[PDB]
Subunit: 219 residues, 2 copies
């Protein structure tokens, strides 16, 4: 038959039984237990687009020697407080980690770096660490699915998309609940609705780009 592409997507969604899902998660529970900065993969990388590079460099060299020039910019206030606390050896309460901003300018979280110096505090500071910094969770748990999510799946989850795919699981949103279905159900209902799909891939993007010109070899 001939149903419109938006109508075939709605038909695809209506074929699912939300009570037959593998598991389900409440969006509000995810937002409460996992701040966005602890899910996005870019938080693990140096924050070279947030801070001036000189301040990241001044902070790095200050941490290596615990002496020298202090970056006193207001943007680097909390990273400076964290850096000088590790040097002298003063303690940082869990309340400080809750308001500090979580993410260190060099990549990663304050809590993980603090736990590397004080290993006994690792368990108590886990709620303030990036999901990639926490131990590998057991299969079937929420943290397991989050740790195996690519950047596209994370952004779709954070933005509350109607649906997204992560590995072999299809996530469907209805209200404040995400319902997970396996690959076989995803393929079956997409085939019943006369639909084909592909995940968002960088294979379309050209990586040899000058201005608005994509270059390629041609012998």
């Amino acid at each position: 038959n001939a149903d419109s592409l938006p109508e075939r997507i709605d038909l695809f969604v209506s074929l699912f039984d939300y009570n037959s899902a593998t598991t389900s998660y409440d969006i509000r529970s995810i937002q409460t237990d996992f701040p966005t900065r602890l899910l996005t993969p870019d938080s693990m990388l140096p924050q070279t687009s947030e801070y001036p590079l000189k301040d990241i460099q001044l902070l790095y060299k200050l941490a290596q020697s615990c002496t020298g020039k202090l970056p006193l910019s207001p943007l680097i206030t909390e990273p400076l407080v964290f850096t000088r606390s590790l040097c002298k050896g003063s303690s940082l309460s869990p309340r400080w980690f809750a308001r500090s901003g979580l993410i260190h300018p060099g990549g990663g979280t304050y809590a993980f770096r603090y736990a590397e110096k004080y290993p006994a505090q690792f368990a108590n500071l886990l709620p303030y660490m990036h999901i990639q910094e926490r131990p590998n969770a057991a299969e079937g748990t929420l943290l397991y699915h989050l740790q195996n999510m690519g950047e596209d799946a994370i952004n779709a989850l954070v933005s509350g998309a109607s649906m997204f795919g992560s590995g072999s699981d299809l996530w469907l949103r209805k209200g404040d609940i995400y319902y997970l279905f396996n690959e076989e159900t995803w393929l079956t209902n997409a085939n019943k609705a006369g639909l084909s799909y592909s995940l968002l891939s960088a294979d379309n993007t050209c990586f040899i780009q000058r201005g608005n010109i994509c270059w390629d070899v041609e012998d």
Copy 2:
């Protein structure tokens, strides 16, 4: 040659051009002063729905009709009441304001539609799409025929970009324009194939990270 890498072939491609044999040349430092970025980007002609609350955009449109009637709208609220109360504005106010009106376009274009006398003296503060179509060969003609990608490449000062039938090559502070045949000839000499950034592969039926399509 065949042993040249893809970045090496691009350098060979650029070296094949005679910068003295260019069709025309423009100075970047002069383009930046004569044309602010907000007057070149095509999205400035559209309503600034990503910069102001939509309720605050409609209320600005309601007051513009019936001239009776916060801090995020401090500057455009001055313009709307100046338009209503007939307070003729100065060009120094345009060069100091944000130029772009929240409902799309520029302040100088809306101010020149009520007062069509100072229209010629307010062109440097209007968008290139609002100015009349320039004649071929002029700088404004090339700018008015640039797509969204060519505009961003020019503003970013890219090493090169293509716009229509011209190839723009940057050598320091000067952009040199070459014809389509010269572009295609030197690319073939360097063993290169090229294409413009296109949205023909961009997926517009997207739900999350899933791109949907009709099964054939």
